Scaffold this active site. Structure first.
Site, mmCIF file in Angstrom:
data_model
loop_
_atom_site.group_PDB
_atom_site.id
_atom_site.type_symbol
_atom_site.label_atom_id
_atom_site.label_comp_id
_atom_site.label_asym_id
_atom_site.label_seq_id
_atom_site.Cartn_x
_atom_site.Cartn_y
_atom_site.Cartn_z
ATOM 1 N N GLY F 51 0.790 -1.232 0.000
ATOM 2 C CA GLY F 51 0.000 0.000 0.000
ATOM 3 C C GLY F 51 0.820 1.280 0.000
ATOM 4 C CB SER F 80 4.674 -3.197 -1.507
ATOM 5 C CG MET F 81 4.541 0.381 1.998
ATOM 6 S SD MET F 81 5.898 1.122 2.934
ATOM 7 C CE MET F 81 7.280 0.712 1.878
ATOM 8 C CG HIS F 105 8.320 -4.882 -7.051
ATOM 9 N ND1 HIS F 105 7.051 -4.770 -7.578
ATOM 10 C CD2 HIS F 105 9.091 -4.011 -7.744
ATOM 11 C CE1 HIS F 105 7.059 -3.882 -8.557
ATOM 12 N NE2 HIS F 105 8.285 -3.406 -8.677
ATOM 13 C CG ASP F 146 7.507 -7.606 -10.229
ATOM 14 O OD1 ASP F 146 7.997 -6.563 -9.752
ATOM 15 O OD2 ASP F 146 6.634 -7.597 -11.121
#
Lengths: 167, 170, 170, 171, 171, 166, 169, 166, 169, 171, 167, 170
Positions: F51, F80-81, F105, F146
């Site tokens: 996010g 992500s985060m 990533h 990725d």
């Protein structure tokens, strides 16, 4: 409503809608809850249902037969379909309908429907109804294919209920 | 609404809407609850209803006749229909209407597909007419005629018809 | 709001919207609840209403006259219509309006199909005019004239008309 | 909100929106509740309102004047309209604004059909102007002129105008 | 309801865009906490992209009006009125966590609010208050509130918007 | 209401995409648990596809700021985060269940402007570098592609300390 | 809220499609029940048409991680991850009611799907099913590629459950 | 598209509540028909429960302004503004069908302010007075009460010139 | 847009509930067809459960006003104003197809309803029906208060239509 | 499509609130009609409660830029920018029908538009243009654009907003 | 779609949905239009319909029997209900089904439903089906009460269609 | 979209979506239209479809086999399902796929209640399998096995399976 939670305190369950997975999971949950509360005292399952999914109906049926307490079934208003199948599945001697109740045994999601026809659950329904009404499979097969509505008295004579609750 | 739950403490049930399966299940549940609370003390069913499904109406009717407590029926506002059918089904001597209430027995011709098919195969119209005939003392011929037309009754006329026992005068 | 349930503890009811069947059933339920709580202590019905269904209005009216407690009526803001009819129906000596309240008795010519037919067959418009006549002390002729036109009254004029007993002084 | 009911325990009412019938009925109900709780202790009405219906505004005004407790009025943010009319209607000596509050008395021209007809027949605009005149100490002529134009006042200017008694200056 | 439990610890979370609803909620909580205890200070956590200046001034004025010190702690972001409220915390008690992002650029308000801001010249008022609370000249505040310069927590401290970067103890 | 009962056991569930609403919720729970007890550690379960970095940094900073140790446990997924917050748990107390999937990533209006002016991407890469023990060069390369990691690979990478074996 | 009362009896109902929200809810309930009592076992009733494998693996891993035995009982249907979780119950304590329907066919969000194929989670599913049913990987691979519904008895013979709960108690 | 074919026969249908959109539509059709032919008269059929007086006045003024006679024919109902526009047709050319119902009872934000400052109610009453031949006193009384008129009563009142008998 | 092609053949379809929008549309088509040709008659097919009496009277009045004969043909159903308009067709030219169902029961917007009861439009309906059917007002009053459905044959015997269209042409 | 047939007669209908979409539509029609014929004049009918001043200025500027005279005719109402555009028609060719209502009170615009108006002082620009086109002093225009005074068609003509009230020939 | 309007030029009508009042009015309108175009050339009514309202179905039926052109009926996909009733109502010798079509005669708004039971339209349906199939009313009554699906061949043998259109 | 109507001029039909009753009726209508235009010139049916209802699929299939013109089938993108069933149903020698098309015959287990009941009573699954068997030349045993599992075919494999006659190579 909070009325249904107060009724649960009196071991009363209301099946007053079409039987889908959500309804089945709710009814099953209430049955399991009441067994956990008290495994000896019987349960009162009031039925006013136009029918629904047979997989969802079988979930309720199996749970009724599995738990220890007797489950009394009382038809108010209407029981078509799986509704009437569940009505006929109550503890023996304890299946009722109120005098003006209407009963129909006519058996009219994606993955569920495929399962039913591969495993031949229609045959399973007909055989269970045959056992619980005392009617022959031939008669059950005929009657579950047509739209014959039964009065409370006729349902008793058919073997779907044990007694018409007289006022 | 929390007013209706407080009213349930006083054994008062409000039927203030069109009678469908949801309403019937709610009213039936409240009647079963009040019986479980106390099977001797009578129940007060207030009716302000334009009518509804006959299958749903019969569910309420059957539950009223089944339970042990007397169910008093009091028409406020309007009872057409199944509404007036339920009004006439209250414990005998205990069916009322407030002075400016309006009553109609016209059974029109709110229910679902399967319900409607059942009503005509089992001839529930005949069953309604026969019960009304018994509970009003009117002949089946008169009930048949009056349930086919739109005749509105005052509270007095409803008492005179045999739908209620008394007009509650201030 | 939960404020209305706390107000119910002080026997205060707020009629602050258009009068339909839902509102009527709510107001009727609250009146029946407060009687069940205590049948001697009087009730305070505050009115800020642009009017509504006459069938719904008569349900509230009949319930006010039926219950034992005195029902005080207090107009804040506005009472048009059935609003002003209910204002005039409060316990005698106990009908009030705040100084800047606005009152209109115009009965316009919210209600549903069956209700509207019942009103005209049973001539509830005549009934309204007659009850207003009795409760204001005006002749029916004058009530008939005024309920047909749009004349707004101040709190003082409403008192002089006989719709209220007193305008509440700060 | 949970917070407004806790605030009601401290006899604090928040009028933080446009004034329509629902808001008026809510504010009136809270005022009647607080009087029933205690008729002697005064009430704190905080106002952050862009205005609204004059019928709904008058209902709140009348209730403020009717009840026994003093009602202090405190403008935070803004008071335009009926908002500023209610601000001026607080108990005398107890009408306040925070330093960066903005006040406008412009009575524009939130009410419904029947309400609007009543206002013009009964001439409630004249009634507003006369009440503002009495409560500010300004002449009706000046109130009439100012309620017709869009002049925004600072908290200090509102005090000098007579809409409030004091601007609450920081600690 | 986590926010109601936090209110017990005198913690207020300003974690959204600042409109009238948010301002009324934040003001209400500040008034509530003062009523609970006028001596113990309050902790206002800020993660806000900005909002209406009228609504922001309501919160600002309430902070300065109440007795308790209001500590401000920036987590995440403070742009706009968010950073204006961060700078308005009790002096010595304005903080940011190390990765917080601050922007004073003054770019949500309704029709009547916007007209009031420009007539009463609230932009000038903002710039003057920021000048006083940061120790920067009005000329510098005017320039920086017109452009989109983001500040790190350290840069915000060096600017005078906060008093300390809360450096975490290693764990 | 299961989450309110879990709060009683000092358990927080981060089971969704990280936006400002989620961040404010997670931050509030962390602050609440500190106020309840500043010594007993907290359990943050993570099943998040990622996010907003601003929202993520708000949670990150709050985790480091409060006194209690915050254990991080990846169930299902951390992209992500999500994985950034997994790596930010108290040292020796960062876990993943055996079939968890981890990706580092790094893929509103005012927030996005802030990130690029203040260079928060550089800030992320450096914090990840410090907490994994990997060089900034390797973090920069891997956060641009990725690559999904198993629980074991995430441990070997230095994102977690241990995979909780049944 | 019947489900909150059921939680008091250590009963969890998985009665819907398995997505991240459902998984987080089921995981939360499992963690809650362990905190209540780490010794008494848990009853997980399954009526599920399947769902996301990432969400399913989160439930699976949590079941294996916690100390209490988790009994699995199929009512109605288990297709998918539903049947995968059914097979993942404590050994000796995996059940189905007599008219339950079970399908292991593994049918064929954005970031989740990419992870599954890079990390080869399909292979991981097949190997776990193989271990827990006692069937060879070859047979599991074949059967998870076709739509073969099993009765409760057939599911027991396959090794997905230990017992068909006979109408009694 | 029936209404576009009718426009070819110089027929306009006012069959709804009168708001600004309807007024702009009716005005546009009147202006179009004048541009087509300024001599041949126009047929305005009215079945309207009423509406905005500002919108109604826009139609009224346009009817009086254009060169062609505008015949007005009430079918069904004309309450409000509806009956005001019925009364505004070319003299000798205002009609109602036998079972039409007519009521003269005169029951956005900026529009409403304009009406009361400029006293458009007085303006309506006076135009009705001129066009019916009734006194302003009688118009004032009748526009304040809800008296429905039959087609015959509307003719006797002076709102129409003739009831079109089958 | 089949209806625009049908308009070329002077055919109008009234196949819905009669509100102001429908009435304005039907009236517009009748006025259009008169303008096209005032001599050739018009065919109004009716399949309608009824509707607003004000809207119905607008259609009725327009039918009687225009020069062309308007033939009325009931297909399916005519209850209400539907059957009232059916009875209002040119004399000798009111029809129903063999399995059509007709009901004259007059069941029981804001401003419209007030007008109906002040001007006593119910009385006006009954008197027109009486004139056009040949039945007494007493009988019309009785029958419009009850729900008696008529077959096509019964509707003809009642005087609502002139002929049942026999399966041919 | 009635409006497209009207465009053939060089008639434009401005019958709504003036926003960017409406302005772009009106500007487009004006440019189209100039391209059709740069000599024959255009008829702009106005029934508008007002709107955005940026959108209004776009229409105004386009009217003054194109070669054809643009006649303005007020039907129903012109408030705001509506009355500003009415006053902007070719001189001698500004009309109103007898029952039209006119208000010049300058009270729809988006965020960036509103900031531009107050920085560039477009309110001053409006007042100065109205002053030039009515023949009233700026002082009078300033006063009247701040209050809600509605004008009859005759009063609007006497004010200098229009050149003639179109009096209908009796029929 | 504009495909249906081009098809109308070839006197082809598509009944490819549930039969309600809107559909009936549309089908009736197209039949009347095609008669007005040419009263001699026959019409092709393709049917792929799960059924619907009997009042709406009777409107289409009556219009088919009323107009001069022969109406050929061709079942593609499915005809249940009123769909199959309309299929059986095509011009004699000109009722067809494609080889894999499925046919069911099982006869499963407010004012419409009341009319049907007062005027006994169910009896009317059964009698018309009896006449058009050549089956006895007793057999039609039995079969319209149960859910027996027919293949195209079985529908032909039953008398619902005249021919299976062979590729 | 006006591109599909221009394509209809070239006797090209695009089946680029899931096959439900609406799509089937649209495709059937276009096939009937093109036959009416010219019964001799063949039709080009492009298929990019993930599948759908078997009743709707059979409607298209039957219409293809009924009309006089040859119907060429060309798979672009994907054909699963009923999509691939229709691909295999094209005029013999005239069934194609573009090189990167993907084909699956898995008949899963988009249709409505009554349709589904019909399929299992009349055993349309058996009917599908038998037709595929005839049109691919594969045994019913192999078709039964392959329609029960999810095996995706390349364009070459689809040709090798007998679903198409030729891969259209650039």
């Amino acid at each position: 409503y909070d009325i249904y939670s107060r009724l649960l305190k009196d071991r009363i369950i209301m099946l007053g809608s079409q039987i889908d997975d959500n309804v089945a999971n709710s009814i099953v949950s209430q049955l399991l809850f009441l067994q956990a509360q008290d495994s000896e005292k019987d349960i009162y399952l009031y039925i006013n249902s136009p029918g629904g999914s047979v997989t969802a109906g079988f979930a309720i049926y199996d749970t009724i037969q599995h738990i220890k307490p007797d489950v009394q079934t009382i038809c108010i208003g209407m029981a078509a379909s799986m509704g009437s199948f569940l009505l006929a599945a109550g503890a023996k001697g304890k299946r009722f309908a109120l005098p003006n109740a209407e009963v129909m045994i006519h058996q009219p999601t994606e993955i569920e429907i495929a399962a039913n026809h591969i495993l031949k659950t229609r045959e399973k329904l007909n055989r269970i109804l045959s056992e619980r009404t005392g009617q022959s499979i031939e008669k059950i097969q005929k009657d579950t294919d047509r739209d014959n509505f039964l009065t409370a008295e006729e349902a008793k004579e058919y073997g779907l209920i044990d007694e018409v609750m007289v006022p």
